[PDB]
Subunit: 447 residues, 4 copies
């Protein structure tokens, strides 16, 4: 009573990546075990008076919960074992892509299995669940058991014994596709049928975790299915209510690096850098090529500020647009211990309140050979989709928006001038800017 | 001065190197040496002290009159001038292809869509057939009578900082016609198909000088000289071709690397030096400690990339046991702070004998792992073979080479600064601190490490 | 009489008469074999069978033609097969199985003479029987068998110009000599009568002429010469054909006719003809998928699959990226490059954009798909409109491995698919795409297409 | 006898009678149709035609079989086509044009029953007629036509083992139900009598069974029942087949059978059989090219050309990189993929290396060729030996776009080329490579192959 109420009042958030302590026996009451969060306490507090949620290799599920009106499966605890990363090669291996909220899972049908798929407990559970996850009604999706994902992880807290003794939470998942597959046992050369699952890992919403009180609610026989969504992710509830169509929006999405919006890419509102940026925009609006020269100078300064040895090559054109405007070179490495890196640059003078589309960046990325990097210089900013495209696809492109451009221009004004700011602008417009070289980019290595 | 001037011309070599920008003007003098900050073409090809007509260089195929020697009649030379060039920006399937580093030039003839008949109904293509008939000679006499093809290209130059598109050419060498074929082209403005000639040309090597003496032309234009007496000022490669034939071509063609190649001596520590004994101790130690040397290589490479002031980020080791293509993984932050772009680095370690070298294959094993925006680093106690470096320079591989010398030097620096003592500690540190990492991580993942 | 005919024959035999690819010849079924020129153009019957040779005419009726078999000293042989194709019709064809001429790359797709009313298996018809009998020798297992193989002289009824006017009928254009590179079974449908029927589809390789862009008709004179053995008929033959006779199928990948032309197509070229059926088809496709993005993505995946299989490439159906929203890649597929025992999987990244047929696709838009490509990956861009000149230029220059499918190609492909699968009902295909695009969506990585 | 037959037939049609791909069946032509098991295996005649139906046997004579045409209430239809592939060579086949099985990717290459003693065009013989008449329906232009299409049930004679007892004959292996994906003309040579003859070549797509890796044989029972229309026989058919009946050609690239297995082949799987003719061929090739590097390079270019053209892909002959010395790339080729209107070329980088057949190729050697590959380029590696396990797993894990040609594939390919072009004379090909390797060399960049 008081213990179960104590349980129902304390959130048990488990985040994606948390290394849980899984062990034979142990205690459902101890919150932490062997320096790690105890799995058995996390899934079954013990104050509920409920059996443990077993997490064996493959598919797991506790006994069915007989509610007052209807019965249901509480959850499905799936544990994946292999952590190959190139060590073990197999097309039937579980494929985890949690950053895009997608997991390719495989059934528990074995080469030595006598029955037809899936008469195995795991695949039977997976079929039962899949029938509910594909439900076209809210009532069928309400009964649909979530797929809690776990994997064998490696972790050395004291700097030793990282292997084994751990499991890692990988999120809650919806079955979006079930397929029958055929596999061949590489040991015996035997072809056996199996099941395979497309899993969509839902978003945690505000946080990247899941409250395991949801499981407690689903294991509560006094509660109907409709009253078990209090602590469930808003994404999951949205799937229960809207269905498959709600999946593309509720799917988990993780980016490696941070994305900066327009305000972060632009200098402050009433700053001198803002006025400077506006003067630059008013100057190079009708002057494209001089702005490309200025862009070459700016990019040069940017790469030289990072400590990299930069070499300005040439400007590609004096007319007719093009995807590449200027060429540079970066000798990455120590003195007499370096390698040449061809740098492809692109200048785009646009209104500081306007933005650069991902295809415009891709026009620069597409040129990049192996050992080449890109650089984009603009008076405006870059769209969110451009940054997402660059980060998620790992495009080797350095971004130089209105803020960095303004700062570099001001600094260069302070560098060489007579007390004015039109020194750099005049240096860009007149003289040098007319010269162009009709040579291949890679040839920048030779100069 | 019918002899004295010609003698003064005959005793002065005119070395023209590949890449030399020459001044070509209409109605240019043959006496003026330097013109408008560049060498005058007409004086170069015809000094004027000879009293001979100048060798014209119009856009396309050019050739002076036949030189009737004492026994045989011969064509002195065929001056070729490639027509278009502008960064390319020259999109058309019949464009001349210049690959001077490998001594190869694909040249297209001057047959026009309005030209009636077949190639070579034009003078130039006729000269091409006439020449190629001798360039494919089976005898020494035929190859002796064969006229050299001097190649020139329209080039945009910069005298005193101002760009000049026209009025200048660029010497590309003397080539041998190694192939002639017939092609069919379609003119965009005409839409009609017309036949044409196609030449695969092999630009000969000028030796270490990489140039030719234009007195050779003077000898070939000399009617008093037989064909056998005109090879004094010719490059040894061409003479080798005339004497040997087709079998000489693959060895006498021009071969120029984009950058220099370090010898094994250059990559290895000097004899009797401290870093020599240091490298010896390193090899002696890591001969049985592979993973430890992998860790050491990671640290060394990290220090190397750190030395330039560049932003480097160490990662992890691939395998603590077994064999593979990559050993360690790092990252290089390219660009300003908090706005840079991550560059994944793949590092390979290989502790071999300091005298032994690393083959192009095992380097390519690391090169073939590099995606776009990724670079590599190879650390060894030995050197990198000449051919490996050749394939790194020529094929444009993004790989930092750290041989025995760089390894020894960087190691001594490391032990001087970080460990403040002898190498021993550091060595122990390469076994105790790490060297063991049975990790399960993807190379790209380091971007968010 | 005897001396006259003999000296005339010897005169014809000793004088070369070169016909070049694209030569406009006057064809009259009643024309004689004496005049070297007729109605301002070269007389066909003189060029193929001069009067001084004393031989019957080489008739060039509609379709497949062949003179009576010549009994040589060594053995009997078929001199040649003369093919007259029509109309091609400047992109205004209504039959999806019309002859496809690509003389710039030395390939011609030619369909047999099997008709909807033909009873029995192909080739019961004359033409197909000749094509099979020729196919036996164009794939001869020895040089001796290939010596007997009758050259396929291609001709097509074209419109010429005389005195500033246009003459539509009465002239044929020479398209070179061809080798039967492939001969396969096909099923066609008559769009007017609604009948379906088997037929033979042939991949023909137009041989390079060598020193000239054409052939000497004395080759045929020798092949038609009963006094000459088959091995004695190669004295006026192209070097490429001699090389093929010697080597066989090994020579074919290197003896095809090649014309160096601009690979940049105008907007008009990428689009179908003005009043063509493919134009109306394209208009229907644009008006339908104007508000149906992902259905057009599915259609584009199927069309891409068809286009790839058309080149013999073994394409594997992958999936669609999403059922809502937008992105760089719209669909994923896979091609197995190589053979059955030896092959490597190349991942196909697809992109579909339904814009106005008159509108154009920018270089940025194609670069967005190209940038996603890794080594071992290829791309494909399907659109109802055209690709801009700058886009194509940047593709050619920087060597972008992307297959372009514009309005004309899309319309033709879709028409072929519909005629060959749904009884010529476009609505079946369109409704299929509308109803099945959601279930064609997975959130898998492109690489995972290898596991299919 | 009516009530008994009704009850029997009903009892048969009530029970699902399944057969999976790989299942071994005892075939005795003189056996009965009542016993479920025969000599320790499932009785073929019971599975294909149970006695409860009172229907005749579906005989499986060597080659192409088919029962009598079923006259339904709607139309007349062929029940099925039962195909028996006889030779059990494991590589030791003496016939270059033997049936190829790639069941892991649902692809089977099958050859017709045209013989040297056969007089007439393909297919005057019964089997080829059945295949042509079937292909007419497999490429049916409507769902109604595809409804009538008889499924090709594949059977392969495989030596079985029963607890220590290997039996060579009397057993067939079910290899699935196939759709005729392609049917073309082929010319073959008989290595025993030395006679050449035309024949039919078939590319077959083995469909996925879906829920089961096989078929329910009640499907055929319904296809044999005259009381049923063609649209009433899909109740027990595989879902992939129903999808093909609906969609047609569009369904093919997405219904093929797929077995998830390791592509890593051992040295035995890469090498020909021990007593094979391919082994002798490979030994001859090794003993010949042990000191002839560049001739082997030319041979490898030709072999790669042959491999890339099997599917029908447009492979262009390029050139050899060197006449002397050694380099990373030995030859260059080109593959124009898909479009055919605005064709995209794919640069092929080739590497040849003649080593001992018992030796293998290291991952470094492969990566030396792979490193040279740009975007939209593919590699090909030809060797007399094999490829090491580490090389294979390194190609797989990193997705290297390189086609591997080991000793087995090389020997088979060369043998087929020789039999199909040089009258079975290997020396003609070898000496051709010796004579022509020097002139096949240019010094052009690989990219220049685009201008070919
Ligand atoms: Mg190593
Ligand atoms: Mg799209
Ligand atoms: Mg080799």
């Amino acid at each position: 009573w008081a213990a179960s109420a104590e349980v129902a009042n304390k959130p048990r958030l488990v985040f994606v990546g948390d290394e849980l302590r899984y062990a034979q026996g142990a205690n459902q009451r101890d919150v932490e075990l062997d320096g790690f969060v105890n799995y058995h306490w996390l899934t079954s507090p013990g104050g509920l008076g409920l059996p443990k949620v077993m997490l064996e290799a493959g598919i797991n599920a506790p006994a069915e919960v007989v509610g007052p009106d209807r019965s249901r499966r509480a959850l499905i605890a799936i544990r994946s074992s292999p952590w190959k990363a190139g060590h073990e090669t197999n097309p039937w291996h579980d494929e985890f892509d949690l950053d895009h909220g997608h997991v390719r899972y495989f059934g528990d049908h074995k080469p030595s299995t006598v029955g037809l798929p899936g008469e195995t407990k795991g695949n039977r559970l997976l079929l039962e669940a899949a029938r509910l996850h594909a439900g076209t009604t809210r009532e069928e999706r309400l009964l649909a058991p979530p797929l809690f994902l776990f994997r064998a992880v490696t972790v050395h807290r004291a700097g030793r014994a990282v292997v084994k003794g751990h499991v890692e939470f990988c999120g809650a998942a919806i079955i979006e596709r079930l397929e029958h597959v055929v596999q061949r046992d590489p040991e015996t050369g035997r072809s056996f049928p199996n099941l395979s699952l497309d899993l969509a890992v839902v978003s945690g919403g505000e946080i990247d975790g899941v409250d395991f009180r949801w499981i407690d609610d689903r294991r509560n026989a006094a509660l109907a299915a409709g009253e078990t969504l209090r602590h469930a992710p808003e994404s999951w509830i949205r799937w229960v209510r809207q269905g498959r169509l709600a999946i593309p929006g509720i799917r988990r999405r993780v980016l490696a690096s941070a994305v900066q919006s327009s305000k972060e890419q632009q200098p402050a509102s009433g700053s001198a850098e803002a006025a400077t940026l506006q003067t630059l925009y008013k100057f190079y609006d009708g002057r494209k090529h001089a702005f490309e020269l200025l862009a070459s100078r700016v990019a040069a300064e940017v790469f030289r500020e990072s400590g990299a040895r930069y070499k300005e090559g040439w400007l590609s054109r004096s007319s007719g647009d093009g995807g590449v405007d200027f060429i540079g070179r970066i000798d990455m490495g120590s003195l007499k211990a370096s390698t040449p890196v061809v740098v492809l640059g692109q200048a785009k003078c646009i209104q500081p309140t306007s933005s650069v589309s991902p295809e415009q960046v891709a026009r620069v990325v597409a040129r990049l050979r192996r050992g080449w990097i890109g650089v984009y210089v603009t008076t405006g900013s870059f769209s969110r989709q451009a940054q997402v495209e660059i980060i998620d696809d790992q495009y080797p492109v350095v971004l130089i928006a209105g803020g960095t451009l303004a700062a570099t221009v001001r600094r260069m004004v302070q560098a060489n001038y007579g007390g004015d700011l039109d020194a750099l602008l005049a240096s860009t417009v007149d003289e040098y800017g007319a010269a162009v070289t009709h040579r291949r980019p890679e040839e920048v290595i030779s100069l």
